[model samples]
Target: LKISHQFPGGTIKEGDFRDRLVRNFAAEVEKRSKGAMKFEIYPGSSLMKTNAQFSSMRKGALDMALIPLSYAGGEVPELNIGLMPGLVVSYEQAYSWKTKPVGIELTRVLQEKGIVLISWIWQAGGVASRGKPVVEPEDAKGMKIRGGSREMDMILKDAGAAVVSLPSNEIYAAMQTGAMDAAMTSSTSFISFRLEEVAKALTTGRTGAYWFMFEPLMMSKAIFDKLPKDQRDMLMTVGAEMEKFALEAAKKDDIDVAAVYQKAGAKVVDLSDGTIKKWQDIARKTAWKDYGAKNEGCAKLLALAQQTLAENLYFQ
Candidate 1:
């Protein structure tokens, strides 16, 4: 059997995290399939752009791809619930939620929509500024910030800042041209996109933001169904293991990458307790009011997410 795999723009040549994910996933699949299955990997948008990837896979242009769930907010608002800011505190908390009842149910919802979610990768959360540091909500006021999705843009706007929606790849140029004064995204992107030199500071800790900021290995349902039962089972099993490995790898990377950003002259500031609570409250209200009004599944998912957070804290 033949399979095609796609990833966002990045190099697999260097020992980057994306490289590790691809290399490790391919090795495991090949080893378990014993030459019965073959995978053709395409990195750096050689196959399709990020926004078009899911539709292309559905239309049979590709078999599988690592998709950013947030990018689908326009078509599937329910999935964007995971992008709600200030919910996920640490990598472990995020990983645990992925395996919980709520996470499993959310995955079922995605699969029902004709997309098979194989794994949940993690990324560090931070704010990147051009000339100022994001120490408080006031710091973001009136700033033109580049964000990834509508929900994020709304959050920034509510925080008293003006936001510009642009693809992650366009942030560098937007900043250079004075189009955007700041950007908030994963720490991994700061290094991967070579924004370390341009971004003056990276605020430390969770900015009361957590989204499925990591990639989810997804495939066309039609393609997945065509595989032999044995092959399908093997893929699913290996994919689960790979997801676990990726989560662990991400936890480590979050720590290491934050230090690297600090070393690169990016001042990392920890948000105060008051500011953190403010962001969380606004995020919760926005998620409940806006997303909940439009997507029933999102409301259910948010409730479950709150329950999951409470349960995890009790156990801890």
Candidate 2:
């Protein structure tokens, strides 16, 4: 099988943890199958373009990818909830969706759409700004920023920021050229993209953040169905186990990013509970409201997600 991702590639021992997860999965699966099953890992979009991976996977032209689910919002608007600002503030709440009704429904939806989620991964995001750190909603006023998703952009625009729609890969150049003053992305991207070199300030998500993204390892349903039952089951077992590593790496990056920015002379900041509340309020009024209006499926998923979090006491 072929596994492709847009991030840089590295060995299982070093480099990006996302890449590491792929490497680890490939190694373990190969070992378990006695080399009967092997994978070619393609990172940095070396095998295929970033935007085309999802469509290619659905068509069975691509085998697997660790991609941000919300990136498929153009094709499946319901997936947009994967990156809805403030909906998933903590890793616990984010991962809980997997076993909850929300996750079941999301999984079913993807299966019907020709893809199967292998590993459900979530990452919290922080803002890397060229000037002042963006902590509160008010701080975004009159600035050009990349919010990483349409819903995120909606919240940023409502907060007075001029939203720039672009992928995380392009953020570095955009910020360097002054086309974007700030960009919100995963903590790992802040490190991997070397945003500290271009940014003068950072709002770390270690404490609290309104932006969270669901980037999962997914396989084409067509390809998955073609595998033997034992191989299929083993693949899922390995994929499920990989989530633990993903969570650890993501949390570590959240903390490590502050130090990285500090070392570069960038002002590093964290959002307080009060500040996060302010951003959440804006997101509810803007992103959340607009997302539900997309369709019945979108509305139902939003409701279920809210219910899952509330019942788990995340709101408290």
Candidate 3:
């Protein structure tokens, strides 16, 4: 088996934590299975293109991927909720999905769609602006921004920003050439992509970032169904424990991104809780509300997710 992603490669001690995650999981799974199962890493989407990976996985053409879950939002609108702005305010609520209603349904939904979550990872995001600071709702006006997902784009559009769509892999080129005025994505991505060179102001994730993402290590269910029980069991067990590793790395990147930006001479600011609330109000109306009304299927999924968040007391 192999886990593919569009991030950079690195060892256990360097580069993107995401590549390291794949390495860690691969090593553990092999050890746990006593070498019965082996896995490899394909960083920079060496195994496939960013946009094609999901469909490849769905059709069993690919084995696995640790990717932004919302990239499939165009095919499955319900998934756009993965990156929906202001929907998940804290890491606690995001990880609680494993034992919560949202997580259970989320797991089941993906399995039905031919994917199985191996390690669930979440990351808080920040805004990187090329010019003036974009911490407030009004600052977005007239800017061409990459909102990460359709749901996030809707929220930004409502706030007066012109939005464009592109994967994280394409973001640097877009911004470097002046095609993008600002971009919003996870803190890890900010560091991994070296976004400091292209942006002047960075709204850090450590304080009051309203953006949260569901990027998880996933496997093709079709492939899973064919594996021997022992190998499959070991894969799931090792993968589950990998969440803790992913969490620690993701949290570190949140802090690390701020430092990377500051050292690069990009002005960095912590968003106040009040600033996030304003974004949340707009997200509720445009992103969340519109999501729940997209269709009955997406609505049902949203209901379960909201219930899980409510019960977890994240929004309380």
Candidates' C-alpha lDDT: 0.69, 0.91, 0.88
Which residues of candidate 1, in runs, are more than 4 Å off?
1-14, 206-214, 272-274
Ordered list by TM-score, greatest first: 2, 3, 1
| Candidate order (lDDT) | 2, 3, 1
Best by TM-score: 2
Better of 2 and 3 by TM-score: 2
- TM per prediction: 0.89, 0.98, 0.97
> Which residue pairs in candidate 2 collide?
none
Error of 2 at 282 (Å): 1.0
lDDT of 1 by residue, 162-224 (tens): 989766766777877778888876655666666776778777554333433756777777888
- What's the distance in Å from true for residue 103, model 2? 0.1
Tens-digit lDDT string for candidate 2 (1-316) = 9999988888999877889999999999999999889999999889978899999999999999999999999889999998987678689888989988999999999999999999988999889999988888889999999998989999999989899988787888899999998999999999988899899999999887888899999999999999999999989999999999999999999899889889989999898999988888888999999999999999989998998768668455
Estimate, for each residue in 1-316, the C-alpha lDDT of model 3 and write its tens digit.
8788999898977889889988988988887788788777899989989998888898998999999999998888778888987668788777877887678877888888999898999988989999987898888988999989999899889989999999998898999999989999889899989899899999998885789989898899999999999888888898899889888998899898988998999999988989999998898889988898988777887887777657766465
After superposing candidate 2 on the true structure, give the runs of residues whose Cα lies further than 4 Å from its correct spot.
314-316
